[PDB]
Amino acid sequence: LANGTVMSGSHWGVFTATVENGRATAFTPWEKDPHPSPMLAGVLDSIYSPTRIKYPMVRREFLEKGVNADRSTRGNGDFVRVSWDQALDLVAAEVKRVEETYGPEGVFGGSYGWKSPGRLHNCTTLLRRMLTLAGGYVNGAGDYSTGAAQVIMPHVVGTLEVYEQQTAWPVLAENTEVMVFWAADPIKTSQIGWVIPEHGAYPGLEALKAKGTKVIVIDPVRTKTVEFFGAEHITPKPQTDVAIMLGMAHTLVAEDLYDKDFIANYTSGFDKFLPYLDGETDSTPKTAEWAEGISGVPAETIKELARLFESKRTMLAAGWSMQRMHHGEQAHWMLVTLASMLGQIGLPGGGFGLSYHYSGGGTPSTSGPALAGITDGGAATKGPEWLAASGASVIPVARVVDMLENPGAEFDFNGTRSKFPDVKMAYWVGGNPFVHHQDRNRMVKAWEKLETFVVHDFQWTPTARHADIVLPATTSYERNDIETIGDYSNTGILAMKKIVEPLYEARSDYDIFAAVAERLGKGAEFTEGKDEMGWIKSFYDDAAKQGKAAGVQMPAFDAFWAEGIVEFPVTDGADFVRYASFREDPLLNPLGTPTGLIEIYSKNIEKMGYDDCPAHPTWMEPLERLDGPGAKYPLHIAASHPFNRLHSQLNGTVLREGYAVQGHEPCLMHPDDAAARGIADGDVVRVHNDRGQILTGVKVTDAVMKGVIQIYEGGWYDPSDVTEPGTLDKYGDVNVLSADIGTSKLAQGNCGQTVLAEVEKYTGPAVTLTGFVAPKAAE
Numbered sequence: 076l077a078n079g080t081v082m083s084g085s086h087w088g089v090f091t092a093t094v095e096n097g098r099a100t101a102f103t104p105w106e107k108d109p110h111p112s113p114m115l116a117g118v119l120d121s122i123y124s125p126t127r128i129k130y131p132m133v134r135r136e137f138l139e140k141g142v143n144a145d146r147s148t149r150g151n152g153d154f155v156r157v158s159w160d161q162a163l164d165l166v167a168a169e170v171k172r173v174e175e176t177y178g179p180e181g182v183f184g185g186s187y188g189w190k191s192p193g194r195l196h197n198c199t200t201l202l203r204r205m206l207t208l209a210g211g212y213v214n215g216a217g218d219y220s221t222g223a224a225q226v227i228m229p230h231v232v233g234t235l236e237v238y239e240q241q242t243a244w245p246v247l248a249e250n251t252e253v254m255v256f257w258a259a260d261p262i263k264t265s266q267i268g269w270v271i272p273e274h275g276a277y278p279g280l281e282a283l284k285a286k287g288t289k290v291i292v293i294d295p296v297r298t299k300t301v302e303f304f305g306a307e308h309i310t311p312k313p314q315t316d317v318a319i320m321l322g323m324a325h326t327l328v329a330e331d332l333y334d335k336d337f338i339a340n341y342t343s344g345f346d347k348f349l350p351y352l353d354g355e356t357d358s359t360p361k362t363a364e365w366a367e368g369i370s371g372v373p374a375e376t377i378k379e380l381a382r383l384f385e386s387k388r389t390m391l392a393a394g395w396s397m398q399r400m401h402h403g404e405q406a407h408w409m410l411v412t413l414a415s416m417l418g419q420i421g422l423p424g425g426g427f428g429l430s431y432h433y434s435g436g437g438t439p440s441t442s443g444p445a446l447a448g449i450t451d452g453g454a455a456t457k458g459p460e461w462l463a464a465s466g467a468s469v470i471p472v473a474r475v476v477d478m479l480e481n482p483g484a485e486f487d488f489n490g491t492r493s494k495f496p497d498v499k500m501a502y503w504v505g506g507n508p509f510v511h512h513q514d515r516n517r518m519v520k521a522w523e524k525l526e527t528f529v530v531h532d533f534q535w536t537p538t539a540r541h542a543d544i545v546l547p548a549t550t551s552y553e554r555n556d557i558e559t560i561g562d563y564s565n566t567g568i569l570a571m572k573k574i575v576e577p578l579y580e581a582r583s584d585y586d587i588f589a590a591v592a593e594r595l596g597k598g599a600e601f602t603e604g605k606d607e608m609g610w611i612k613s614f615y616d617d618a619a620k621q622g623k624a625a626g627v628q629m630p631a632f633d634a635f636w637a638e639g640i641v642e643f644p645v646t647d648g649a650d651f652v653r654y655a656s657f658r659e660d661p662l663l664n665p666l667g668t669p670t671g672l673i674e675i676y677s678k679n680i681e682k683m684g685y686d687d688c689p690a691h692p693t694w695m696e697p698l699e700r701l702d703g704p705g706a707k708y709p710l711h712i713a714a715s716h717p718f719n720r721l722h723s724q725l726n727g728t729v730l731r732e733g734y735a736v737q738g739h740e741p742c743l744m745h746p747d748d749a750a751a752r753g754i755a756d757g758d759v760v761r762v763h764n765d766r767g768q769i770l771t772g773v774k775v776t777d778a779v780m781k782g783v784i785q786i787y788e789g790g791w792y793d794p795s796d797v798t799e800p801g802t803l804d805k806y807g808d809v810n811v812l813s814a815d816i817g818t819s820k821l822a823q824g825n826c827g828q829t830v831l832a833e834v835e836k837y838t839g840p841a842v843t844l845t846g847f848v849a850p851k852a853a854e
C-alpha cells in the first residue's frame with residue numbers, strides 16, 4: 076500500500092494530499108495560495124463519506140416494468156444492485172430505443188451542472204460526445220447564474236460582459252476612491268473557480284483596505300464583505316434595487332449633476348429615457364422619495380450616495396443575485412445606465428464590473444496559451460436533420476420543467492419563437508437538478524413524463540435518489556487530468572494527479588460512456604484510439620506549441636508532469652482598464668451594438684414588443700416582493716449561495732456538523748421577526764408558502780435585516796413521502812419554496828431569489844433525517 080504525497084486541484088484550489096496505506100488522510104493547501112478555502116477538508120471527506128455511491132443500481136420498479144413502471148415512487152430508495160455489464164447493456168438499449176422511437180428530440184442532454192474541473196474528465200462534454208454518436212439530443216442554453224444579464228448585456232454594451240476580464244485589481248488600488256459592492260459578497264463567493272481558482276480577489280481586497288478606500292455594500296445581509304472593510308452598509312428590501320437606482324438617477328438630473336458630455340458622445344437613447352424618469356409618461360416622477368416608499372432606504376441616503384458617486388472615482392461592482400429574480404434583465408441594464416450618467420466608464424478605477432465576485436475576475440492575466448480539452452465532436456459532424464415540428468434543439472436551461480409539461484407549445488426567447496420538443500428521456504451527469512431547479516413540487520410531478528432517467532454521480536444526492544438507473548462515478552482524486560489555474564488570470568497549468576485507486580465499483584464517466592458507445596457500435600469514434608494519458612498529453616502538447624509561437628517557453632510533457640505545474644509570466648495584464656479604448660476613441664473602437672454606443676433605449680428590443688421587457692430600464696412589480704401591494708407572505712428568503720458548500724457539493728460530509736441546526740439547514744432570522752413568532756435560537760421551524768413547506772433550524776441574528784430570512788441554496792431535499800403531493804422536506808432545500816417562471820420573454824432566466832414565505836415554530840411529529848445515509852439496498 077502506498078505512502079507519500081501527491082499534488083492535485085479542484086474547484087476549491089490546489090492542494091497536496093498525504094496518502095497513508097493507500098488512503099488519503101489530509102489535504103493541505105498549496106503554499107502559494109493567498110487564501111485557501113476552509114471547505115478543503117470536506118472535499119477529502121466526500122471521497123469516503125457515508126453517501127459515497129458504491130455500486131451500479133437500478134430502481135426496482137423500472138427493472139421489473141420498464142416504461143410501464145409506476146413513476147410516482149422515484150426517490151423512495153427501492154433500488155436493486157446490478158453488475159456493471161447488466162447496467163451498461165440496459166443504458167445502451169434505452170438510449171437506442173429512445174433515439175429510434177422518438178428521434179433526437181426525445182433525449183434531453185443539457186445536463187446542467189458544476190461537475191469537477193479537468194480537460195479530459197469533463198463529464199457533461201463526454202455525455203454529449205456519446206449522445207452525438209447515438210443520434211443527437213436536445214441541449215440547454217445559458218446558465219442559472221446570469222440567465223438574464225447575459226442576454227440583456229449584448230443589446231446594451233454589445234458583448235456578454237459578465238464573463239469578461241475586469242479592470243485589474245492593482246488599477247483599482249491606485250485609482251478608485253469609492254468602491255461599491257452592489258448585491259455582491261466577494262469574500263464568500265471568491266472561494267471557488269470554474270477551472271482551478273487562484274483566489275486572486277483576496278490580495279485585491281486587502282490592498283483596497285490598506286489604501287483606506289471608502290467601501291459601500293448594498294445588500295440585505297451583513298456579510299463578511301461588510302465586516303472586513305467596516306463598510307457603510309445599505310439594506311434595501313430585496314428586489315427593489317432598480318427603484319433605488321432610478322431615485323439616484325432622478326437626483327442627478329434634478330440637481331443637474333450628471334455627465335452630459337459622456338451621455339452625448341458615448342450613449343444612445345437617453346432622451347427617450349428622460350421622460351420616464353421625470354414621470355411625464357406615467358405621472359410618477361421616480362424621485363428618491365418615491366424610491367424610499369418601495370425600497371425602505373431613506374430618501375436622503377439615496378440622494379447623498381448619488382452625489383458621492385458623481386464626485387469621486389467610483390467603481391460599481393455588482394453581483395448576480397439581483398438578476399436571478401423576476402424582471403432580472405432590468406437590474407444590470409439600469410446599473411449601466413446609472414454608470415453612464417456618472418461618466419467614468421473607461422477611466423482607470425471607474426465605471427462598473429460584473430465579475431469581481433466570481434472566479435478571480437480582475438486578477439491580472441498572464442501571456443500564457445489557452446488549454447483545450449475533449450470535445451463533443453459536434454463541430455466536425457453533420458448532426459441531426461432538424462426542423463420545427465419535433466421542437467427546438469436547444470431550450471433556455473431553466474425552462475426544463477415547462478418543456479416537460481408543454482411539449483409542442485411555443486416559447487419566446489430573445490426575439491424568436493420556438494417550440495418545446497417532446498422529451499422522453501433525460502441523462503444527467505455532474506449536476507443536481509433535484510436541488511438546483513425551482514419549485515420542487517412542480518418538478519417532482521413533471522418528471523413522471525419521462526420514461527427513463529439515468530444519472531451518474533459519486534454522492535447519493537436527491538438527483539441520484541430519483542434516478543431509474545444510477546451509475547457510480549469516480550472523483551477527480553481517483554484519476555489523472557490537466558487543467559488551467561485561473562478562469563481570467565491563466566496563472567498556469569496544473570497536473571491533476573491520481574491520489575487513490577477508484578473506490579468500490581466506481582468508474583470514470585469517460586470509461587462508462589466509452590462502454591455505452593461500444594454497445595452502439597461506435598467505440599473507436601468515442602475514444603479516438605487514445606487512453607487517459609494519451610488524451611492528456613495531446614492537450615498539453617497543443618498548448619506548448621501555441622506557447623512556443625507566442626514566446627512562452629514550456630517544458631516537454633514528462634518534465635511538466637514531474638514538476639506538476641507550469642506558471643506563466645504577466646506582461647501588461649496588470650494595467651488592463653476595461654472600456655479604455657472605447658472611451659479614448661469611440662469611432663475607431665465602437666461597441667458591438669447597432670449604434671456602436673451604450674444603448675439606454677434599444678430599438679431592437681422595442682420591436683420585440685414584450686410586455687415584461689420594455690425598451691429602456693423600467694421599474695415593474697414582480698410576482699411577489701416584501702411589503703408589496705397585496706403580498707400574501709411576510710418574509711423574503713435570501714436564497715443565496717452557501718458559504719460552506721459549493722451549491723449542494725459537500726452537504727454529505729463532516730462540514731455539515733459546523734452549520735446544521737438540530738441536523739437541518741440553518742435559517743438566519745432577525746431577533747424581532749423571531750420574537751413575534753415565539754421562536755428561540757436553535758428551534759426547528761417550518762418555512763412555508765403556497766408552493767411548498769420545508770424544515771430548517773433557526774439561528775437568531777441581526778445580520779439579516781428585518782423582514783428577510785437567509786436560507787442558502789444547495790440543501791439536500793429529503794422528502795418525508797415521495798408519493799405524497801406537497802410532502803414536507805425534512806432537511807431544508809430552499810427550492811421547495813421558489814417559483815419556476817422566466818425573468819421575462821427576453822431571456823427566460825430563472826427567478827430563484829424571488830421568494831416570500833411564512834415561518835412558524837415546528838411542533839409536529841418528530842422527523843428522522845434520511846438524506847445523509849445511503850439507501851439501505853446500496854450499502
Ligand SMILES: NC1=NC(=O)C2=N[C@H]3C(S)=C(SO)[C@@H](COP(=O)(O)OP(=O)(O)OC[C@H]4O[C@@H](n5cnc6c(=O)[nH]c(N)nc65)[C@H](O)[C@@H]4O)O[C@H]3NC2=N1
Nearest residue numbers: 188189190191219220505506507511531548722723724827
Ligand atoms: N434558489 C436558488 N438560488 C440560487 O442562487 C441558485 N444558484 C443557481 C446557480 S448560479 C447554479 S450554477 O450557475 C446552480 C448549481 O447547481 P449544480 O447542479 O451545478 O450544483 P452542484 O451541487 O455543484 O451539482 C454538481 C454535482 O456534480 C457531481 N459531480 C462532481 N464531479 C463529478 C464527476 O466528475 N462526475 C459525475 N458523474 N458527477 C460529478 C457532484 O457530486 C454534484 O452532485 O444552482 C442554481 N440554483 C439556485 N437556486
Ligand SMILES: NC1=NC(=O)C2=N[C@H]3C(S)=C(S)[C@@H](COP(=O)(O)OP(=O)(O)OC[C@H]4O[C@@H](n5cnc6c(=O)[nH]c(N)nc65)[C@H](O)[C@@H]4O)O[C@H]3NC2=N1
Nearest residue numbers: 220258260264293294296313314394395396715716721722
Ligand atoms: N462559497 C461559494 N459557494 C457557492 O455555491 C458559490 N457559487 C458560485 C456560482 S455558480 C455563482 S453563479 C456565484 C454567485 O454569485 P452571486 O453575486 O449570484 O451570489 P449570491 O450569494 O446569490 O448573492 C450575493 C449577495 O447578494 C445579496 N442579495 C440578495 N438579494 C439581493 C437583493 O435583492 N438586492 C441586493 N442589493 N442584494 C441582494 C445576498 O444577500 C448576497 O450576499 O458564486 C460563486 N461562488 C460560490 N461560492
Ligand SMILES: [Mo+6]
Nearest residue numbers: 218219220221
Ligand atoms: Mo452559477
Ligand SMILES: [O]
Nearest residue numbers: 189218219220
Ligand atoms: O454557475
